[PDB]
Amino acid sequence: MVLDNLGKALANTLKKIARASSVDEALIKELVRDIQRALIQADVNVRLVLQLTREIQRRALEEKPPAGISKKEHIIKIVYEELTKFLGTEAKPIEIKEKPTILLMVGIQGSGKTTTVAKLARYFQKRGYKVGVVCSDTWRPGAYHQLRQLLDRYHIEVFGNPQEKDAIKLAKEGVDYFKSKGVDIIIVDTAGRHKEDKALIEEMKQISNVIHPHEVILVIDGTIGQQAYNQALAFKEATPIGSIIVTKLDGSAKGGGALSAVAATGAPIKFIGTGEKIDDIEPFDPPRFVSRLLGLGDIQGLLEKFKELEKEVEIKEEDIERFLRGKFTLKDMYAQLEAMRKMGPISIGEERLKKFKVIMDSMTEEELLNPEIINYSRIKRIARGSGTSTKDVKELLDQYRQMKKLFKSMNKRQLS
Amino acid sequence: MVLDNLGKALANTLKKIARASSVDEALIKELVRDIQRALIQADVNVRLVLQLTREIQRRALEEKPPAGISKKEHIIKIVYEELTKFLGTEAKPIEIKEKPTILLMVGIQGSGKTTTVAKLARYFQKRGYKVGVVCSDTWRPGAYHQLRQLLDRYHIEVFGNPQEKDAIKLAKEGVDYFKSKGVDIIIVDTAGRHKEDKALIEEMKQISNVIHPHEVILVIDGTIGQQAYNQALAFKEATPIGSIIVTKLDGSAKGGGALSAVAATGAPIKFIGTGEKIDDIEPFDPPRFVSRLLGLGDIQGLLEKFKELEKEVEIKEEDIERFLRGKFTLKDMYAQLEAMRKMGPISIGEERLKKFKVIMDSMTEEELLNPEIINYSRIKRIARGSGTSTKDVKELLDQYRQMKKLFKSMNKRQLS
Amino acid sequence: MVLDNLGKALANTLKKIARASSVDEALIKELVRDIQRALIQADVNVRLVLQLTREIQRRALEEKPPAGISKKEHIIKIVYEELTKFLGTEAKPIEIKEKPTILLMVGIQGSGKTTTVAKLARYFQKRGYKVGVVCSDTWRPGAYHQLRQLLDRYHIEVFGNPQEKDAIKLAKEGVDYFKSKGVDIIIVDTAGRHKEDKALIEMKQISNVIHPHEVILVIDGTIGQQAYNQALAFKEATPIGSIIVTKLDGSAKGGGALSAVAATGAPIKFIGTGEKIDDIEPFDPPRFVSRLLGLGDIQGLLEKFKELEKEVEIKEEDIERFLRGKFTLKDMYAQLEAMRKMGPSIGEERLKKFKVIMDSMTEEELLNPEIINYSRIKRIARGSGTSTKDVKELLDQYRQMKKLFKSMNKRQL
Amino acid sequence: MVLDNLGKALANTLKKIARASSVDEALIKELVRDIQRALIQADVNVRLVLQLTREIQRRALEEKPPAGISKKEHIIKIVYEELTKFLGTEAKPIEIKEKPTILLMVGIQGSGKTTTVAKLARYFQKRGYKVGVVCSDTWRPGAYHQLRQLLDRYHIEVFGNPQEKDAIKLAKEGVDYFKSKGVDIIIVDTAGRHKEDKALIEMKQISNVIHPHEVILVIDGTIGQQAYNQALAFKEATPIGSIIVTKLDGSAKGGGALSAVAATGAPIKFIGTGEKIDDIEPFDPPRFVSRLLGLGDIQGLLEKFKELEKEVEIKEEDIERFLRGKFTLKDMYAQLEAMRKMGPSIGEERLKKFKVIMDSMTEEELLNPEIINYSRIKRIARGSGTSTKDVKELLDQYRQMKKLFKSMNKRQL
Ligand SMILES: Nc1nc2c(ncn2[C@@H]2O[C@H](COP(=O)(O)OP(=O)(O)O)[C@@H](O)[C@H]2O)c(=O)[nH]1
Ligand SMILES: Nc1nc2c(ncn2[C@@H]2O[C@H](COP(=O)(O)OP(=O)(O)O)[C@@H](O)[C@H]2O)c(=O)[nH]1
Ligand SMILES: Nc1nc2c(ncn2[C@@H]2O[C@H](COP(=O)(O)OP(=O)(O)O)[C@@H](O)[C@H]2O)c(=O)[nH]1
Ligand SMILES: Nc1nc2c(ncn2[C@@H]2O[C@H](COP(=O)(O)OP(=O)(O)O)[C@@H](O)[C@H]2O)c(=O)[nH]1
């Protein structure tokens, strides 16, 4: 849900960077291409993708990381910052200042407008506002009842009249009525049409002149991908007070293309629709959105990994109970150590452990599993095969025998 | 590479459990079905999958977790333990005791036998052994040269004669020759055939009687999935000293079906092949393998998550520099706190923060982004909308103003 | 959309059988394995899959094709009839005979029940019947206006009272009322429940008060094989029970749900197919299974012809290039392989020999036959293992067809 | 296997054009968008994709189809010729004219060079030529025995010395020797390099000593669009350069590599296709692009016919069910829709009206036409908006076909 695949793909290019052995020009070129592929696949206009990834390439190649910041962390920064501007740079909230603050909603059939009208009403009501909705949708009068269905539970008033045929008349009667009732916010649901043709924009100019809304909000179906550009653009040109809600971002392969498309337009995206239910709407705040997108600041994720690790306890416990009965092997030790040195942030020491591994990599399975069998000629083979001395080998073995004695002789009443 | 998809799918059922709200019978039934799907998809025989998931279901449903172990952690344990037995229970290494320890390799064309012969020779040489290989493959005499190609770099002797036509003669001349040269280990590469027919098993019984190997090793192509069963079984019945290497597990959708199939047979799997290169072989140790498979003990993973998190530093840094100039918002605070309480393992307190969130969820975007605008009537709306008091609301705001004053007045010389 | 990939997976096992070189026992084991994989992935209960897939294996291993039928064609027939029986075997339509034929609809929240009430009203209305729906759904009010929303444009009476709190009362009142206005069919939408529990099935009350001709449980198909226990409990609790399975569109587990329900014997009357009023189709197992496996696809065959003709311009440019005397052995080799499928001129054995010869020519030779020396013809006959006579034969046939094209005129359609 | 999904993605855009209701400008924008997506996903350089995909858009928006060609067929022709030029335009085979025609093979480690040396020797040998390969690969010895391994069963002379440490010396010695034994073609395998750097291209040395007829760089196709810089650097450094791209089988980025190389103009002579000695095919852009897009698929059309006939048993059981007088309106409706595609009896407008009527019948009515009352016929004509006369018409046609079947005998094949 919500750009979804695009998220994973973008985050992975950033992980790759974090994990990269070093930052050369080849790393960048791959990053840029990883991003082009992810973007294009989410239906982002090709020209837009080129422009963005050429800026990212450029900034990475020729920009010195500020003091105490690696080339690597600065790349992560460049990508985050470029993507954020690519989706509108910053939040542009809806201001509620005027008394009845009037929001006029426009959109074609199947944009998800009716539903979005309910979502927006509920968003505001949840936050202590009195809301009235006015249904002036004469194009599919079933909308009055659909709004009743979505909104009655919340006692949010829905003014309508499935038996009125003048669209502008309807919108004015409604606004005046709900305005009489004392509301803070009025949301006006206008008639859809099949496409966003001249008729539709003309009808919005007319309804807007008559009711004088605080804001006109075009609802765009985000599954149309980059085709949202021209729809947003025509709208943004027919109204000095326009904003956009983009719906159906959940699961859609193409929502990325819609957001980037609308943002290329200048028009402000204020909310996104996120599913079919009344609460499935979230305000759009580019830097925060792009941050969830890229998997940044994932402290929750880190905690899940810890928790998951801890639930492995009965397994670890039985491992240890095996050690207590002396069933402890060179493989078990190999691992104990391996974990110890991968724990920063009976201790061997980094170099000595690095040597210890090298020695065991020259042992056979049967030796790792039954050290007891490791006689002297074996030791001289192990030493020869690992490029170390028979001394080192007997050292490692001593360490093993030491740790083995420990476990074999343990309280049988503890917890590691 | 290596069961790959099956790994991710199995690990996810275990993650689901770790994350589950509670452990009821419905959770189990879903786990079992998640595992059937993963298994069947990797070509594990259906009857085998039924038997395994019925045991897992049973143990989960009717088994009490030992003292101090949750139902949840005990399920994780049951799954790990069942899967481990399903793939052979424990390591059965190859013992090198006899002087020339002789390993006789059998397999059909395209099993990856020739390559596996080199991998096994190199595995042993790397570990300080003198190795000789004897190529008695009269069925595709190009094999002598292929072995030379793989093995010359290591100075591992390859006895052969692309111009000898008696297979058993060849294998005996070779063994005697390489035996004269002083080797610890001799690997004998017999002639393949098209399928594993009676001819092939008969020819192995004959060659085995003549050379008297320490072990006979059948090389099975793991991309055949569950069809490995009958091949392993026929072999295991034609020799009291048989083991198995399963090749091409890397990337293959069906290797899971091969391992489970061979293990159902009783025959010991000693190594797996892992790719085309000479080092692409690993010993098979069921509990360790099933442990990597299920993503258990992933301390490395945890460390990667930390490292990745740290590379986000230039971003966090610029966030903070915004706070220093007083550009700090209710959203920024909302987050600071949210992270603080998700950090165990200026502090508010769990209940107070839970209340704080509830209040902000009743604020609008413009309020969260510009607290300054929050006059008194707004506060009474916020308080009403959050089901709290105007006192609580002014409390939260005070906390905000406090934290805001802090940042606005900071050294501009530190690091958070 | 509906059972999408399950369909393709099954359809492919049949193509593989049609395409099979010969029908040994290993072709049956691969078919049986391929089917188990497709079914398990659609969330079919694994025990069911064994049961179905074993019978298919047996029937195919130990059954002699009737007279004039190959082993291949009988395997196809086996797979098709087993899947048909697997999914219910035969259609069991709703019977409208009584005046107010009354349908009681039950379901848990989110199963798609309320939408389904509407789709079904529309189904009948569209066919000439007068329909009225009684909304006795007191559990999630909003259901009443949802039915208004969906149904008003069809002037289908919707009786309800979003203020009535008694479910039995509302149902009784509504049925009586709608029955007054002389409707042929009454569909009653009952109150949902969070889950299908003793509370839900305890529908018996309403059913005992309104005496429905039929009681339809609406099941969300995305639950997959979990539909089994749900349909079973419901079928146990009523002698007059039928099922509608919804949300089959795009569903990964729809397969599992249909087979789950059918393994219960409760009849599947319709399937839901989308969110819109028309996304409902009556269920008819053999028709369904035939579309599923892509059987009798004349439409498919036609499309392929259409598409092949659309290539006309390209074909015509190739030919214009021949009239200009640019016509290679490559082009010829293709024209022949082509002609050996113009059915349903040179022959089938002479063509077979011509191939073999060209397969010993190099790329420059195939592309510039003009350059073919005398020694080259020796190299070729030698490499192809044929007589230089064979080689010069082919080269003549070439020279023929060539000049033939060179001396056509642009009146070539 | 080779360019797998790229092929399907492109082939589908053409099916969509063939299937298009009408050809407006939005059908071109979707085609152009669909192509950009397929190409970008195959790792084609994005700037190339713009360039190609813009030209395709223009040529289609502002070009009038020649006489007798529809807009549709011209779009198909456009897509096909652009992709062809995109991938090299026309075949450029290796020319064997000189006695020892000498081929110098270069490549970096893992590009598949040594295998490719062998596949190519085999390619020629198989066609009658005497071939000898000189292994001057001092960088990864093992290459010599690899060539022995691959080549001995063909008695293709392999000259080498895994002990010789001088690359130029070994090449010179080997060429001279092999040339003595009277080989038509000599293939020289040069030492690889970790990467294609000044060191690698500084091949000029060997080329100046043995004077090859041609120098072939072997490129690993899985590097995708990174092939461009590699082919460019190499082509700059030699007037006689050709490319072989390997590892195209299963490759996700093979597309990107072919277009990368072709945008350089260096001729692509062969492609590698697998690990085996026979997995090499000469590259011929128009042939390649035609297979890619699935053009001229007669084989495809045949397969579909074959598969449809294999359904005979099922068809025959359906019919046996008719002879028993079990033949519904469902069956009839199907027999008719069917017959309206028996081309290429009732008519096309009478059938159109029959549909409409049945579409107002319920499932019990379609399945038990016997039950169709007098009032039912009113309900139906009313719901279908036709005359009860129309309804009884259809019902007659039914009754006809029915008894007709009922009175066939089991001599029905
Ligand atoms: N998945 C999803 N569906 C949505 C969203 N918004 C609206 N829809 C659905 O889109 C369809 C049409 O929207 P609706 O408001 O009902 O009608 P409209 O006013 O004509 O566009 C309905 O099926 C809605 O459930 C969304 O954000 N996500
Ligand atoms: N990917 C992969 N390929 C393998 C493995 N083992 C062998 N192969 C390949 O399988 C093919 C045939 O195996 P090979 O040893 O060369 O011939 P054989 O003795 O006839 O089976 C070669 O292409 C090998 O590279 C493996 O573990 N992984
Ligand atoms: N895709 C799909 N969605 C459906 C189908 N039937 C119902 N739905 C959706 O399921 C959701 C819940 O169904 P609804 O009738 O509204 O509510 P219910 O009575 O509580 O189940 C609604 O969004 C419907 O649009 C179907 O057949 N296919
Ligand atoms: N799939 C595939 N693999 C190939 C192809 N050509 C070569 N290879 C493999 O690439 C690997 C390296 O090629 P090779 O000729 O052995 O070594 P090189 O000379 O160092 O490139 C070998 O495993 C080959 O089997 C090809 O066309 N397709």
Tab-separated table of C-alpha atoms in Angstrom, chain D residues 11-151:
chain	number	residue	atom	x	y	z
D	11	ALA	CA	4.943	-7.718	-28.281
D	12	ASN	CA	2.083	-6.680	-26.016
D	13	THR	CA	2.175	-3.063	-27.073
D	14	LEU	CA	1.623	-4.257	-30.651
D	15	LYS	CA	-1.264	-6.556	-29.723
D	16	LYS	CA	-2.780	-3.538	-27.957
D	17	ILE	CA	-2.508	-1.551	-31.174
D	18	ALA	CA	-3.982	-4.311	-33.300
D	19	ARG	CA	-6.795	-4.611	-30.768
D	20	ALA	CA	-7.349	-0.869	-30.500
D	21	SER	CA	-10.889	0.380	-31.076
D	22	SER	CA	-9.609	3.456	-32.921
D	23	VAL	CA	-6.216	5.110	-33.389
D	24	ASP	CA	-6.289	8.461	-31.583
D	25	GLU	CA	-3.313	10.333	-30.185
D	26	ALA	CA	-3.829	8.872	-26.734
D	27	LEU	CA	-3.271	5.386	-28.159
D	28	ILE	CA	0.109	6.615	-29.392
D	29	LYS	CA	0.999	8.182	-26.042
D	30	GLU	CA	0.184	4.933	-24.269
D	31	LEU	CA	2.198	2.938	-26.784
D	32	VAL	CA	5.147	5.301	-26.424
D	33	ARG	CA	4.827	5.079	-22.648
D	34	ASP	CA	4.500	1.319	-22.688
D	35	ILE	CA	7.661	1.056	-24.792
D	36	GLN	CA	9.679	3.402	-22.561
D	37	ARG	CA	8.730	1.284	-19.543
D	38	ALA	CA	9.792	-1.991	-21.214
D	39	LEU	CA	13.056	-0.543	-22.424
D	40	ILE	CA	14.034	1.221	-19.194
D	41	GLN	CA	13.377	-2.025	-17.361
D	42	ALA	CA	15.754	-3.908	-19.709
D	43	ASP	CA	18.436	-1.431	-18.654
D	44	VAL	CA	18.419	0.526	-21.927
D	45	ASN	CA	20.071	3.944	-21.518
D	46	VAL	CA	17.251	6.368	-20.695
D	47	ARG	CA	18.428	9.081	-23.117
D	48	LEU	CA	18.442	6.477	-25.905
D	49	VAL	CA	14.918	5.506	-24.932
D	50	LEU	CA	13.742	9.121	-25.179
D	51	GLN	CA	15.392	9.505	-28.543
D	52	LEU	CA	13.903	6.280	-29.929
D	53	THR	CA	10.534	6.732	-28.328
D	54	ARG	CA	10.142	10.328	-29.529
D	55	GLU	CA	10.889	9.429	-33.137
D	56	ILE	CA	8.329	6.621	-32.894
D	57	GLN	CA	5.780	9.116	-31.535
D	58	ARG	CA	6.450	11.681	-34.261
D	59	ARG	CA	6.533	9.229	-37.152
D	60	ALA	CA	3.182	7.915	-35.957
D	61	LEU	CA	1.457	11.218	-35.277
D	62	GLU	CA	2.496	12.959	-38.471
D	63	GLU	CA	2.772	10.255	-41.111
D	64	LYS	CA	0.098	9.096	-43.564
D	65	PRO	CA	-0.127	5.322	-44.184
D	66	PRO	CA	0.672	4.373	-47.795
D	67	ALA	CA	-2.276	3.415	-50.018
D	68	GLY	CA	-4.255	0.433	-48.745
D	69	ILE	CA	-2.608	0.460	-45.319
D	70	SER	CA	-4.539	1.422	-42.172
D	71	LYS	CA	-3.148	3.681	-39.425
D	72	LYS	CA	-2.942	0.605	-37.234
D	73	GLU	CA	-0.807	-1.387	-39.644
D	74	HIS	CA	1.481	1.552	-40.168
D	75	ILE	CA	2.064	1.987	-36.447
D	76	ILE	CA	3.078	-1.660	-36.272
D	77	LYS	CA	5.425	-1.075	-39.184
D	78	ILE	CA	6.905	2.001	-37.522
D	79	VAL	CA	7.598	0.280	-34.211
D	80	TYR	CA	9.227	-2.602	-36.064
D	81	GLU	CA	11.553	-0.542	-38.245
D	82	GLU	CA	12.611	1.791	-35.428
D	83	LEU	CA	13.534	-1.140	-33.140
D	84	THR	CA	15.406	-2.723	-36.041
D	85	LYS	CA	17.492	0.439	-36.649
D	86	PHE	CA	17.786	0.748	-32.871
D	87	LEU	CA	19.500	-2.643	-32.667
D	88	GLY	CA	21.875	-2.249	-35.609
D	89	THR	CA	19.558	-2.061	-38.626
D	90	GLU	CA	21.128	-4.818	-40.754
D	91	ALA	CA	23.364	-7.917	-40.466
D	92	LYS	CA	27.135	-7.528	-40.973
D	93	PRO	CA	28.582	-11.048	-41.241
D	94	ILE	CA	32.215	-12.072	-40.844
D	95	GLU	CA	33.887	-12.372	-44.208
D	96	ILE	CA	35.999	-15.408	-44.970
D	97	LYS	CA	37.913	-14.732	-48.164
D	98	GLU	CA	41.595	-14.804	-47.370
D	99	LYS	CA	43.386	-18.009	-46.663
D	100	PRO	CA	44.003	-18.043	-42.974
D	101	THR	CA	41.260	-15.522	-42.223
D	102	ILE	CA	42.514	-14.589	-38.761
D	103	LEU	CA	40.196	-13.599	-35.931
D	104	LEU	CA	41.596	-11.962	-32.810
D	105	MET	CA	39.362	-12.374	-29.731
D	106	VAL	CA	39.654	-10.070	-26.748
D	107	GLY	CA	37.613	-9.615	-23.583
D	108	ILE	CA	37.879	-9.119	-19.851
D	109	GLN	CA	37.717	-11.999	-17.397
D	110	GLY	CA	34.188	-13.403	-17.012
D	111	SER	CA	32.867	-11.851	-20.244
D	112	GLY	CA	32.615	-15.406	-21.555
D	113	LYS	CA	35.488	-14.993	-24.009
D	114	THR	CA	37.076	-18.475	-23.823
D	115	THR	CA	33.734	-20.259	-24.212
D	116	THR	CA	32.983	-17.909	-27.097
D	117	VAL	CA	36.269	-18.722	-28.832
D	118	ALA	CA	35.108	-22.352	-28.774
D	119	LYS	CA	31.495	-21.778	-29.837
D	120	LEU	CA	32.745	-19.810	-32.827
D	121	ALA	CA	35.363	-22.364	-33.895
D	122	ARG	CA	32.532	-24.914	-33.791
D	123	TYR	CA	30.271	-22.563	-35.761
D	124	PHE	CA	32.711	-22.600	-38.696
D	125	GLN	CA	33.971	-26.150	-38.414
D	126	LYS	CA	30.366	-27.336	-38.464
D	127	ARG	CA	30.070	-25.561	-41.834
D	128	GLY	CA	32.988	-27.307	-43.517
D	129	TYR	CA	35.924	-25.080	-42.603
D	130	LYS	CA	39.178	-26.272	-41.126
D	131	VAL	CA	39.710	-24.314	-37.927
D	132	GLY	CA	42.589	-23.956	-35.523
D	133	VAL	CA	42.624	-21.962	-32.331
D	134	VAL	CA	45.691	-20.386	-30.817
D	135	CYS	CA	45.512	-19.948	-27.081
D	136	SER	CA	47.738	-16.996	-26.242
D	137	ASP	CA	45.889	-16.469	-22.935
D	138	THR	CA	48.762	-16.168	-20.448
D	139	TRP	CA	46.624	-14.238	-17.957
D	140	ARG	CA	44.351	-17.059	-16.832
D	141	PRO	CA	46.013	-20.371	-17.769
D	142	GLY	CA	43.378	-23.033	-17.529
D	143	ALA	CA	42.053	-21.338	-20.620
D	144	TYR	CA	44.178	-23.703	-22.709
D	145	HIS	CA	42.708	-26.891	-21.101
D	146	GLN	CA	39.283	-25.270	-21.214
D	147	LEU	CA	39.640	-25.035	-24.966
D	148	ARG	CA	40.869	-28.658	-25.063
D	149	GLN	CA	37.873	-29.650	-22.970
D	150	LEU	CA	35.378	-27.890	-25.221
D	151	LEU	CA	37.049	-28.574	-28.542
